[PDB]
Design a protein around this ligand. Structure first.
Ligand SMILES: NC(=O)N[C@@H](Cc1ccccc1)C(=O)O
Ligand SMILES: [Zn+2]
Length: 307
């Protein structure tokens, strides 16, 4: 309510509640976290990113986004928990402290604010953005089919009414371009993590082509380690591998774009579960999901620091 220590992390929140949370966190830890507005949504809502930094100019950074697909509520809920955990473990956990003393972490909890608000007021299963385009009565674009990586190719739909519609052209969605511009301007990101649900998978590039990435051997081992770490908590089983070999051919995905930009440690997490609840995961699983996911994320971060 009026203190991140009183905030209920075991329940799902609205857009306003999450945004308020950000202000409270920043007010409580001014020396560690700051709120940056990287753009505005199609409908004009501000797009915020939380920057966790210990100092420095343009220290190598880790990017983490959640909620690019509005209906995957477990992701924004995990992002809120992550934000609080960062402030609790710095100075207490030797590994994480080491990470923050040398790198910055950028966390975008609500990557698709228009769609998120829509899931709360009209359609709980909305997945796309909220932009409208003349030649169609259908609304929205699949933000994770809109990136400049094999755009328009197999793995995305060309019909505006489709849940996987890629849009008119790469980066047409302001929600996507806002991230692209910020990452490009920064120029020093070392890791790029995009979180989704559901399926319990840890994926690496590529999704748009069957071509194997040059760093396949290293990324596969990093994923193997992260999955083992995540499983150690509650025994949750995750599969891992390239997007195209694990799920299916998908074009215009964020991770493929970031990897092609030279950001080697690009991974997408697909959280719980494997279909029993799907997108409607019970609130009682928020904390356990967040706790185990953190172990997998920390593993990737550790590798990035020492590499
Ligand atoms: N559940 C869910 O959203 N799955 C992802 C799969 C994916 C991951 C990374 C790149 C491309 C595609 C989707 O965007 O459809
Ligand atoms: Zn998704």
């Amino acid at each position: 309510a009026r203190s991140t220590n009183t905030f209920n992390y075991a329940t799902y929140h609205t857009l306003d509640e999450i945004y308020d949370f950000m202000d409270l966190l920043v007010a409580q830890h001014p020396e560690l976290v700051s709120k940056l507005q990287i753009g505005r949504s199609y409908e004009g809502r501000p797009i915020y990113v939380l920057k966790f930094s210990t100092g420095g100019s343009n220290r190598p950074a880790i990017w983490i986004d959640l909620g690019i697909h509005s209906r995957e509520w477990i992701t924004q809920a995990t992002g809120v928990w992550f934000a609080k955990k960062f402030t609790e473990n710095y100075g207490q956990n030797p590994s994480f402290t080491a990470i923050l003393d040398s790198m910055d972490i950028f966390l975008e909890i609500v990557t698709n604010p228009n769609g998120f608000a829509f899931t709360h007021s009209e359609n709980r299963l909305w997945r796309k953005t909220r932009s409208v385009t003349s030649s169609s009565l259908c609304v929205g674009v699949d933000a994770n089919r809109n990136w400049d990586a094999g755009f328009g190719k197999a793995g995305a739909s060309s019909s505006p009414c489709s849940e996987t519609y890629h849009g008119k052209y790469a980066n047409s969605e302001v929600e996507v371009k806002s991230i692209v511009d910020f990452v490009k301007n920064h120029g020093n990101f070392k890791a790029f993590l995009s979180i989704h649900s559901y399926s319990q998978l840890l994926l690496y590039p590529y999704g748009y082509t069957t071509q194997s990435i040059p760093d396949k051997t290293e990324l596969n081992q990093v994923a193997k380690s992260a999955v083992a770490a995540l499983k150690s908590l509650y025994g949750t089983s995750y599969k891992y591998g390239s997007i195209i070999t694990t799920i299916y051919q998908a074009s215009g995905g964020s991770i493929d774009w970031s990897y092609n930009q030279g950001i080697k440690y690009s991974f997408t997490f697909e959280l719980r579960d494997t279909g029993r609840y799907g997108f409607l995961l019970p609130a009682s699983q928020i904390i356990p999901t967040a706790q185990e996911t953190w172990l997998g994320v920390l593993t990737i971060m550790e590798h990035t620091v020492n590499n």
